[PDB]
Amino acid sequence: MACRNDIHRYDATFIAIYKSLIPAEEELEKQRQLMAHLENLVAKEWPHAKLYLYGSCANSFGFPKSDIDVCLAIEGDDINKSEMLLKLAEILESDNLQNVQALTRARVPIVKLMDPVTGISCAICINNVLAVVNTKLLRDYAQIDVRLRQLAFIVKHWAKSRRVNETYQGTLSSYAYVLMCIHFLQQRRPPILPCLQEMEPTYSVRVDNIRCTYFDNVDRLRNFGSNNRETIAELVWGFFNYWAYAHDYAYNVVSVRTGSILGKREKRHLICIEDPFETSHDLGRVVDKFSIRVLREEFERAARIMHQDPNPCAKLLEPYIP
């Protein structure tokens, strides 16, 4: 079925929505100022350590928030994460940072602080390097074509407004939605995004028993999508059209790792979204036989709105009221 013939009248509204959703430059400047100070602070105690932002705050797909997540990466065979973080908390307190707290996430130790200069809060963990590498991959994809961050911010805001962005309710994580957006753009013809992991690699690190290898010199790919003329409203329409009507839920796996559709049957997997490095991890495994129906009804609602509604941008994002 074809796209509506007035689709481009809604391009500018989607761009306006996108621009309202991304972090303000003034907030990003504050985050970069705090990061430089924290990097210098940690280096005074552990000159061989490195600090990396990860998560929503650095993969180029995070909504505005006064919180950052940082991985302290350090090599060694006897890394005692608790002892390191206790020492770090003491150093942070000596530095006049505020509300320094020792926390845990599912037995993983975390130190949180509030910077009184910038007002930004920061949570630090030790050696969560796979999350850093996942973040790097997404940030690298985001450099290739502006339509990725535009689509992903719109999809993430749709999922928040429609209340289908909570894994505890059997719906999808923001990370899952970004992978879906990357794969949708890999699948366009002409393509908008390449498959970085299928290219001759320039980057390769091993995290535990996971090797992470791909072409990361993405500045050379800034014209990769230039043959594709699809605009943001066409891509929003096409994305929900794909998940509502075209995706084969019984048989297919979406794989950013290959840029392609893999088979499910030979390997809870009701909406199969392959993690690009931890390929045994299906990001949709949180979905169950009930929440898959809610997800697909919302996909269908979105596709019908994009296809027929006279104000699709506003109607698409109308909040779900329980």
Swiss-Prot record:
Binding residues for UTP: S56, A131, V132, V133, N134, T135, K156, K160, S174, Y175, D275, H281
Domain (PAP-associated): residue spans on this chain: 232-281
Effect upon mutating D69A: Loss of catalytic activity
Membrane-spanning intervals of the chain: none
Compartments, as annotated in UniProt: Cytoplasm; Cytoplasm, P-body
Binding-site positions, Mg(2+): D67, D69
Family stated for the protein in its record: Belongs to the DNA polymerase type-B-like family.
Main function: UTP:RNA uridylyltransferase with a marked preference for uridine polymerization and a distributive activity for the first added nucleotides. Uridylates oligo(A)-tailed mRNAs to prevent 3' to 5' ribonucleotytic attacks. Reduces the accumulation of oligo(A)-tailed mRNAs. Prevents the accumulation of excessively deadenylated mRNAs to avoid siRNA biogenesis. Uridylation repairs deadenylated extremities to restore the size distribution observed for non-uridylated oligo(A) tails. Can prevent the 3' trimming of mRNAs still engaged on polysomes.
Assembly information from the UniProt record: Interacts with AGO1.
Protein name: UTP:RNA uridylyltransferase 1
